[PDB]
Design a protein around this ligand. Structure first.
Ligand SMILES: Nc1ncnc2c1ncn2[C@@H]1O[C@H](COP(=O)(O)OP(=O)(O)O)[C@@H](O)[C@H]1O
Ligand SMILES: [Mg+2]
Length: 311
């Protein structure tokens, strides 16, 4: 049998994802011949599957994608508009993680200050908490976060948003990247442990972690400032998370399978932290069609996508 896979990505994503690219490649895997084409535009001819990351939630690509899916229902999308839409919502993703018994830090989707006030007063939402925009993908603003340290720190929150209990996790995050059952993982620096010294809130954009250099004194321990300032608090690669005794291969594979099943997704990245580096993985973010650590071999990626397709 023959299977055609069409990778539909803008040059921007192609540049970050692949060491080098090929316009067309052909290979055999498990007695199937795979023909793989990479293009910035939709296929003129209908393939068996389209492999794609939608760049922005609204715009030309989004519109083209929805139309193509409606008019070619037999084409498998990795990943579909519906999957992108669900995964662009903190509320929807966390509802599914909760429904599927996947540990997360305690989380609440809110639309106003009154709601946050009620959650604090009833002792459901515990300080400190991080505030993440409800729309989680596609803009600079989607990554603009606030850490609320005291009740007064709610005053400038942008709604709607996810309020999620802030975990002191010793500045290590585990990233698990999936192409279906094929995994790649790593540890990176994350955010420092925070202190409730009287400062009411601090702000940072995850794309601009140098913001943390400007936080008022007392929020971060002096030694943590020393240890992270040379790198401008940037997301830096650390040793392998198994070697660090942070997790195990079996734990990562189990978690990744559970998340993929809960969300109905094959191409995803899962971020998890552990309170004081111990106990349950706490999922803080799941991304559709991630960077895979940046710059992977094209032939590797396509073989693993083909493997996923067969499964
Ligand atoms: N509940 C939390 N407690 C502590 N740190 C967190 C929490 N959630 C996220 N973070 C930190 O904030 C960063 C950005 O949050 P994340 O949800 O991953 O958003 P993004 O979509 O910008 O990657 C994470 O990489 C991690 O360093
Ligand atoms: Mg993340």
């Amino acid at each position: 049998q023959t299977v055609s896979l069409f990778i539909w990505l803008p040059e921007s994503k192609q540049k970050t994802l692949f060491i080098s690219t090929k316009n067309h490649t052909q290979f055999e895997l498990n007695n199937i011949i795979f023909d793989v084409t990479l293009s910035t535009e939709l296929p003129d001819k209908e393939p068996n599957a389209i492999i794609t990351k939608r760049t922005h939630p609204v715009g030309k690509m989004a519109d083209e994608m929805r139309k193509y899916e409606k008019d070619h229902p037999k084409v498998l999308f990795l990943e579909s508009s519906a999957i992108h839409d669900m995964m662009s919502s903190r509320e929807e993703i966390n509802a599914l993680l909760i429904k599927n018994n996947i540990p997360i830090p305690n989380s609440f989707s809110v639309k106003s200050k009154e709601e946050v006030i009620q959650l604090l007063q009833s002792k459901q939402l515990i300080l400190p908490f991080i505030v993440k925009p409800e729309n989680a993908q596609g803009t600079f603003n989607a990554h603009q976060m606030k850490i609320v340290l005291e009740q007064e720190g709610i005053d400038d929150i942008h709604f709607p948003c996810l309020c999620q209990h802030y975990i002191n996790h010793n500045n290590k995050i585990v990233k698990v990247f999936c192409i279906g059952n094929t995994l790649k993982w790593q540890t990176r620096t994350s955010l420092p442990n925070v202190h409730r010294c009287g400062i009411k809130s601090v702000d940072f954009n995850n794309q601009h972690l140098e913001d943390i250099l400007s936080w008022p004194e007392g929020v971060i321990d002096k030694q943590d400032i020393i240890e992270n300032s040379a790198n401008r608090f940037g997301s830096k690669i650390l040793e392998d998370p198994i070697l660090l005794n942070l997790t195990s291969e079996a734990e990562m594979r189990d978690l990744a399978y559970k998340v993929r099943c809960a969300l109905g997704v094959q191409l995803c990245g899962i971020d998890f932290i552990k309170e004081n580096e111990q106990g349950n993985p706490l999922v803080v973010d799941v991304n559709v069609f991630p960077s895979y650590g940046g710059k992977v071999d094209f032939d590797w990626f396509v073989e693993k996508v083909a493997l996923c397709y067969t499964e």
